[PDB]
Design a protein around this ligand. Structure first.
Ligand SMILES: CCCCCCCCCCCCCCCCCC(=O)OC[C@H](COP(=O)([O-])OCC(O)COP(=O)([O-])OC[C@@H](COC(=O)CCCCCCCCCCCCCCCCC)OC(=O)CCCCCCCCCCCCCCCCC)OC(=O)CCCCCCCCCCCCCCCCC
Ligand SMILES: CCCCCCCCCCCCCCCCCC(=O)OC[C@H](COP(=O)([O-])OCC(O)COP(=O)([O-])OC[C@@H](COC(=O)CCCCCCCCCCCCCCCCC)OC(=O)CCCCCCCCCCCCCCCCC)OC(=O)CCCCCCCCCCCCCCCCC
Ligand SMILES: COC1=C(OC)C(=O)C(C/C=C(\C)CC/C=C(\C)CC/C=C(/C)CC/C=C(/C)CC/C=C(\C)CC/C=C(\C)CC/C=C(\C)CC/C=C(\C)CC/C=C(\C)CCC=C(C)C)=C(C)C1=O
Ligand SMILES: CCCCCCCCCCCCCCCCCC(=O)OC[C@H](COP(=O)([O-])OCC[N+](C)(C)C)OC(=O)CCCCCCCCCCCCCCCCC
Ligand SMILES: CCCCCCCCCCCCCCCCCC(=O)OC[C@H](COP(=O)([O-])OCC[N+](C)(C)C)OC(=O)CCCCCCCCCCCCCCCCC
Ligand code: SF4
Ligand code: SF4
Ligand code: SF4
Lengths: 96, 55, 155, 70, 298, 176, 318
């Protein structure tokens, strides 16, 4: 950060070279920012996570994932509900 | 990234007005993005008596 | 090695492609206003090599910004078919993606997909001019991972 | 800032400088140092042709001073 | 010889889709009619719904409406003139004043949440109060906007190429404009002294002072001047709104029309029931028909 | 109160006509236009280095949706369908069923992000602050199907952007 | 040593227009508060190469209603005319010492318009024929002033030889004796090359195309490189004709450095006006020349025939 720069360029992030097994030396992405730093970076607040770290809870992820679109880790929509009509199971007995 | 005076004289003269006074870029005069919590007021009907909805 | 030679050559072409995308503005609805803000000096789309150019004969990517009304649907296909075709289509906003607010109308097709093949989808209503910049950046990545020469060498 | 514009000029200014330098040096190189004689009129060409014949080596720029005669 | 403007290329069924939604649900549609007049569109719909409901918004809500209504009029005017310059051929003033449009877009986002479609002005007032410190930024931006307007108008108003491209072009008469249904600038630009902000004041427009720029010749150049002057005049209205913003609530203190505060919805029975019914069914409005209109930036 | 924008009549004295003639022949207003373009050339460009310098937002920003959960761990959504009932574009589909343990949640909570208008009405209607619009706006995808979020993807977002959404509502709950 | 000389001109010329497209946007952006290309290479020093390489690998296609032969030859006409025209320019010593260099450049520059409408006519498009017919009467009407302005200025030369401008403005810049003609000369150059107080040839706002209507990667690249080369020269011709420079016969490099600097400054002004004025309507740009430029053009001509006679300053013919 550099406060002398006009509002908009006073804060910036230099992306890491490697994250989650994907070289980003020449392949930096805008979603590579962890949520705690995403708040400070977007000027949504003035309290860097080092000075004020966010509250910690179990369900919060411990490893940020970038845009997983395209790579074989995408999100495939699917029904989250079970079946509705239970087909009648025929009797395997040879009848008669 | 406030420039050298030589540019400022040239930049001002080329436009014909003092540009250093009022600039298009916000440096520090903006309000801080972390503001103290507010205390919102209440409406006129926030009364414990003589506040029947029929009126 | 032949594979190495085709590998570098493909990268040279793909670099020349992703570093020069010339959108053919199909400004339709409020999604177009936010895209012009990307062209505004706040984000400066031009600085990424990508500059706005008319005459689809001289353009590389379509940026569908706004609702696609059934009346103009032939126009979208016609201007899509006339692009010299290393070509990609970017859909801006919920309406262009799948109908959005007007998904249930009588005269809005439920998504620009039903008319043209669609590359990266930009969600929003409207997607902020920064979000579109991320979208165009995603297309540049997609162009980077093109193996056109490698496939030809292994045909 | 504006000084970032200058690299755009510099790679063009050097490129535009080449034809001026190349033509000037090629003429001097191909005419033995002296500038290429210009013949805007037949009289200038007549001097040049007599220079070609006199030099013996059929080179107009190759010049013979007083030492040729004696 | 004739100019047949085939329209309908973006005939989204808005007027039919509104029927199937509730009054609160139909609010975002008006933000998506005119891409640039956002609060002005919602202000018209809010006034119509409030008029049927026989309910008025609190004074603070009204002042925020006219404050953001005039900011919106800056937004439409900025693009109207600059895109007019773009189509005419002058491409440079496009980019300068569309930096400021980004500055005002921040104010839209800082208050409502979204940069363009605020969905902020609602029947009975506004969604929520201004974030603390917004008025300072509005004052800071408005301080230098007079210079930016002079930046735009200096390169075109006296420019010989510009006037020749607009002077004595598209000239309409007085009675011709009135009969053709022309409104807004087109009446103002051709001598007709009409402006709903003064003749039929809505909200607190009867308290702010401003000058309507009546045009003389009626051609393209006069109306463009009227647009630029309307841009400058909005700054005074912005100045008065900033200096006279009153305290109080931002929604009508009546749970049957505006949703109760989140603190009360989690505390009291009546607030929870009203919040439940208002966000599921909505507020039933008296059976009637109305036609409200506002001086939109167009 | 009206003002006449264009009612200036130039003077006919020998001075004024020469200045207009001097303006005509010796192009001056064209030079004034040129002279000011030079002024902007030497100024400070406002471009922000994306993606190294992301734009400035506000805590009220509406972006990618997410379902949050209580500090205990249990989800906040109790399937009141207020968000589905108030969704202007009907992008919300909800199916509920009695859970095994008693207190019951959604078995299907799908948000159609290509049908969503990002109006934020869902987060207002929610009486338990379960469904919120997170700060993310960079979830662009290559395929249309990846946009059509269901309960699992949304719950993942809640477990990803929780460190940011918690602070935003912490700064904005008093306004609401 | 002539093929080396020619290829020491063609390659620098095509590289000059090559990076003029970078100093266009990087100047246009900075004048509209943008930043221009600074991503492809440092400071955008590789953007045009990325542009050029794409424009020779993306699918070209002749229009279905085209005329193949005339469609293909028009880019040949544009590019060859632009290159061949730089030939008699007297950078210290001109490559080809034409006796009538001025008349040569007038003739071929009058030919660079056959490309624009042969492209327009063969393309068989409504916007193509409109743009083609806009451009032809645009250039020729602007050509009448072009011819007379050159003649009036060159009356102090005594000849049409381009090399003699070095000698003519040896002590005093020519603009100080013909500045009224210099103004219309600059405007006409803005008009023959179709820059943007009169870019109506392209007419992107009202005609979407017209420089290259359906023209694609290759042919579009030509019709661009054939007019951006004219941009650099028409200011090099302006620089050589009006703003002379000291030329030491022993060290021509000083003159080449000075000559290049004047072309660079003039070219920036071409880009500078391009983003400071609106678009002239067709009748206006024709009215400006046929009704305001020409009357002043002839009047200042008669002045410059008489002026050497009244002052006894007839320049030497040789
Ligand atoms: C005519 C051009 C003459 C040469 C350039 C002179 C110039 O503009 O210097 C900058 C300097 C300051 O410019 P500014 O826009 O006021 O700077 C604002 C901030 O200080 C700017 O703050 P900043 O922190 O951005 O400044 C740092 C900057 C400073 O950069 C420079 O000073 C670049 C120029 C010197 C190298 O350096 C960099 O950013 C590093 C990258 C440099 C890019 C490549 C520069 C190439 C220069 C030309 C090479 C040959 C062609 O110019 C002057 O003070 C006036 C010079 C007038 C020269 C007249 C000659 C006749
Ligand atoms: C004066 C000599 C004129 C000679 C002549 O017949 O020119 C026809 C030539 C082609 O006429 P078009 O209207 O383009 O129709 C060409 C096809 O018939 C109609 O289009 P297309 O798609 O059939 O064009 C391909 C066609 C015609 O060939 C070409 O398009 C190749 C280039 C022209 C070859 C002739 O190829 C063939 O017919 C087979 C060639 C083996 O018209 C010209 O104006 C060219 C004159 C070139 C003179 C020398 C310039 C240096
Ligand atoms: C309204 O207004 C408008 C304008 O403006 C008024 C405009 O501007 C524009 C233009 C728009 C913009 C500027 C916006 C942004 C767009 C762009 C920048 C587009 C970019 C376009 C380009 C074409 C890119 C240009 C960039 C580059 C880097 C070009 C680089 C050049 C090259 C790669 C080629 C260079 C040359 C080479 C390599 C030549 C090699 C030569 C040789 C090897 C020798 C050849 C010769 C011989 C061998 C001779 C010997 C042979 C013999 C004798 C053979 C004999 C044979 C026999 C049979 C006898 C528009 C649209 C417009 O709307
Ligand atoms: C007829 C055919 C003739 C063919 C001749 C052979 C060469 C032609 C092309 C030469 C250049 C091709 C590009 C090679 C490098 C490349 O890919 O660069 C882009 C790539 C792009 O990488 P990238 O894709 O990561 O960049 C975008 C993403 N960000 C911005 C986040 C980094 O960059 C590099 O390779 C870095 C190169 C740095 C140095 C560049 C040159 C600087 C000096 C230039 C001087 C003037 C030259 C004229
Ligand atoms: C200066 C430029 C230097 C680099 C140039 C590299 C060559 C680019 C040529 C254009 C792309 C096509 C190519 O390389 O091979 C064509 C080959 C042609 O064979 P192909 O079968 O792969 O063609 C594509 C597939 N069909 C035929 C169905 C359209 O195509 C490809 O390489 C694309 C895959
Ligand atoms: S998605 Fe939203 S912003 Fe985009 S066109 Fe549709 S309604 Fe307008
Ligand atoms: S923000 Fe999207 S999901 Fe939420 S109510 Fe609005 S349209 Fe429905
Ligand atoms: S409003 Fe909240 S609690 Fe109600 S169904 Fe939607 S997510 Fe669940």
């Amino acid at each position: 950060e550099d406060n002398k720069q006009f509002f908009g360029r006073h804060r910036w992030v230099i992306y890491t070279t490697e994250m989650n097994g994907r070289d980003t030396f020449w392949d930096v992405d805008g979603s590579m920012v962890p949520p705690e730093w995403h708040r400070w970076l977007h000027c949504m607040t003035d309290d860097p996570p080092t000075t004020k770290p966010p509250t910690a809870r179990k369900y919060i992820w411990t490893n940020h994932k970038f845009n997983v679109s395209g790579t074989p880790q995408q999100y495939v929509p699917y029904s989250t509900t079970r079946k509705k009509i239970q087909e009648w199971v025929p009797p395997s007995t040879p009848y008669k | 990234a406030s420039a050298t005076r030589v540019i400022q004289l040239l930049r001002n003269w080329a436009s014909g007005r003092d540009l250093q006074a009022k600039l298009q870029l916000r440096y520090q005069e903006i309000s801080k993005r972390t503001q103290p919590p507010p205390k919102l007021p209440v409406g006129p009907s926030h009364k414990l008596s003589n506040n029947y909805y029929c009126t | 090695r032949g594979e190495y030679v085709v590998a570098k050559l493909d990268d040279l072409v793909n670099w020349a492609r992703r570093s020069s995308l010339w959108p053919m503005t199909f400004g339709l609805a409020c999604c177009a206003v936010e895209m012009m803000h990307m062209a505004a000096p706040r984000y400066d789309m031009d600085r990424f090599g990508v500059v706005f150019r008319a005459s689809p004969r001289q353009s590389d990517v379509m940026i569908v910004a706004g609702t696609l009304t059934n009346k103009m649907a032939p126009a979208l296909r016609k201007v899509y078919d006339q692009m010299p075709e290393p070509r990609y289509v970017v859909s801006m906003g919920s309406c262009a993606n799948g109908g959005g607010y007007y998904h249930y109308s009588y005269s809005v097709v439920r998504g620009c997909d039903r008319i043209v093949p669609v590359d990266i989808y930009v969600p929003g209503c409207p997607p902020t001019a920064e979000a579109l910049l991320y979208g165009i950046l995603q297309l540049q990545r997609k162009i980077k991972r093109e193996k056109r020469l490698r496939i030809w060498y292994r045909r | 800032m504006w000084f970032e514009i200058l690299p755009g000029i510099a790679v063009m200014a050097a490129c535009l400088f080449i034809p001026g330098m190349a033509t000037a040096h090629i003429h001097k190189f191909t005419n033995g140092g002296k500038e290429k004689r210009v013949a805007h009129f037949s009289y200038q060409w007549n001097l040049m042709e007599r220079d070609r014949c006199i030099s013996g080596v059929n080179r107009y720029h190759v010049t013979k001073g007083l030492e040729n005669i004696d | 010889r004739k100019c047949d403007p085939h329209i309908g290329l973006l005939h989204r069924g808005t007027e039919k889709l509104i029927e199937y939604k509730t009054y609160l649900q139909a609010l975002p549609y008006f933000d998506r009619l005119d891409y640039v007049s956002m609060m002005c569109n919602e202000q018209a719909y809010s006034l119509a719904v409030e008029k049927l409901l026989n309910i008025q918004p609190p004074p603070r809500a009204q002042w925020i409406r006219v404050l953001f209504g005039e900011i919106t009029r800056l937004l439409n005017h900025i693009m109207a003139v600059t895109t007019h310059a773009l189509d005419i051929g002058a491409m440079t003033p496009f980019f300068w004043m569309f930096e400021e449009r980004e500055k005002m877009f921040e104010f839209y986002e800082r208050v409502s949440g979204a940069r363009m479609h605020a969905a902020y002005i609602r029947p009975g007032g506004v969604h929520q109060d201004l974030p603390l410190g917004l008025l300072d930024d509005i004052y800071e931006f408005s301080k230098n906007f007079s210079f930016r307007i002079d930046e735009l108008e200096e390169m075109l108003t006296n420019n010989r190429i510009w006037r020749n491209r607009t002077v004595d072009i598209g000239v309409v008469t007085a009675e011709d404009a009135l009969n053709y249904g022309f409104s807004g600038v087109m009446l103002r630009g051709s001598g007709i002294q009409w402006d709903l902000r003064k003749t039929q004041p809505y909200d607190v427009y009867d308290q702010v002072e401003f000058d309507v720029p009546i045009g003389s010749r009626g051609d393209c150049y006069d109306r463009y001047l009227c647009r630029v002057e309307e841009m400058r005049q909005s700054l005074r209205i912005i100045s008065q709104c900033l200096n006279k913003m009153p305290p109080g609530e931002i929604k009508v203190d009546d749970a049957k029309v505006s949703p109760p505060k989140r603190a009360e919805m989690k505390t009291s029975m009546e607030s929870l029931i009203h919040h439940f019914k208002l966000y599921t069914e909505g507020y039933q409005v008296p059976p009637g028909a109305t036609y409200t209109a506002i001086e939109a930036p167009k | 109160t009206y003002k006449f924008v264009n009612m200036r009549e130039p003077s006919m004295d020998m001075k004024s006509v020469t200045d207009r003639a001097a303006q005509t022949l010796l192009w001056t207003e064209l030079v004034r236009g040129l002279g000011m373009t030079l002024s902007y050339l030497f100024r400070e460009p406002a471009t922000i280095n994306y993606p190294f310098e992301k734009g400035p937002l506000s805590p009220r920003f509406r972006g990618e949706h997410a379902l949050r959960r209580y500090p205990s761990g249990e989800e906040r959504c109790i399937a009141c369908k207020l968000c589905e009932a108030v969704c202007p574009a009907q992008a919300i589909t909800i199916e509920a069923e009695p859970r095994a343990d008693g207190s019951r949640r959604t078995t299907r909570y799908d948000i159609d992000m290509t049908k969503c208008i990002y109006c934020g009405f869902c987060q207002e209607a929610c009486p338990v602050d379960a469904i919120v619009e997170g700060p993310n706006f960079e979830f662009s995808t290559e395929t249309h199907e990846e946009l059509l979020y269901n309960k699992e993807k949304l719950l993942n977002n809640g477990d990803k952007w929780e460190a940011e959404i918690a602070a935003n509502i912490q700064a904005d709950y008093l306004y609401r | 040593m002539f093929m080396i000389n020619i290829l020491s001109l063609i390659i620098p010329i095509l590289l000059a227009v090559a990076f003029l497209t970078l100093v266009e946007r990087k100047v246009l952006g900075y004048m509209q508060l943008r930043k221009g290309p600074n991503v492809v290479g440092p400071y955008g020093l590789l953007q045009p190469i990325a542009d050029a390489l794409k424009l020779v690998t993306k699918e070209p296609l002749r229009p279905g209603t085209s005329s193949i032969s005339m469609f293909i030859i028009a880019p040949i006409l544009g590019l060859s005319l632009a290159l061949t025209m730089w030939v008699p320019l007297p950078m210290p010593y001109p490559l080809i010492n034409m006796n009538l260099g001025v008349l040569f450049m007038l003739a071929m520059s009058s030919l660079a318009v056959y490309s624009i409408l042969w492209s327009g006519w063969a393309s068989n498009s409504k916007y193509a024929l409109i743009g083609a017919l806009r451009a032809v009467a645009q250039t020729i009407s602007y050509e009448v002033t072009l011819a007379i302005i050159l003649l009036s200025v060159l009356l102090m030369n005594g000849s049409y030889t381009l090399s003699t401008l070095i000698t003519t403005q040896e002590h005093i810049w020519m603009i100080f004796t013909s500045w009224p003609l210099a103004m219309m000369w600059f405007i006409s150059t803005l008009a023959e090359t179709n820059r943007a107080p009169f870019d109506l040839t392209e007419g992107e706002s009202e005609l979407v195309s017209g420089f290259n209507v359906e023209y694609a990667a290759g042919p579009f690249a030509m019709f661009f490189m054939a007019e951006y080369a004219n941009i650099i020269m028409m200011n090099a011709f302006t620089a050589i004709l009006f703003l002379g420079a000291s030329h030491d016969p022993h060290t021509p490099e000083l003159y080449t450095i000075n000559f290049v600097l004047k072309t660079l400054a003039l070219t920036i002004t071409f880009l500078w006006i391009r983003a400071s004025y609106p678009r002239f309507r067709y009748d206006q740009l024709m009215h400006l020349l046929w009704k305001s430029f020409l009357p002043l053009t002839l009047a200042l001509c008669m002045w410059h025939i008489s002026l050497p006679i009244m002052t006894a300053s007839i320049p030497p013919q040789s």
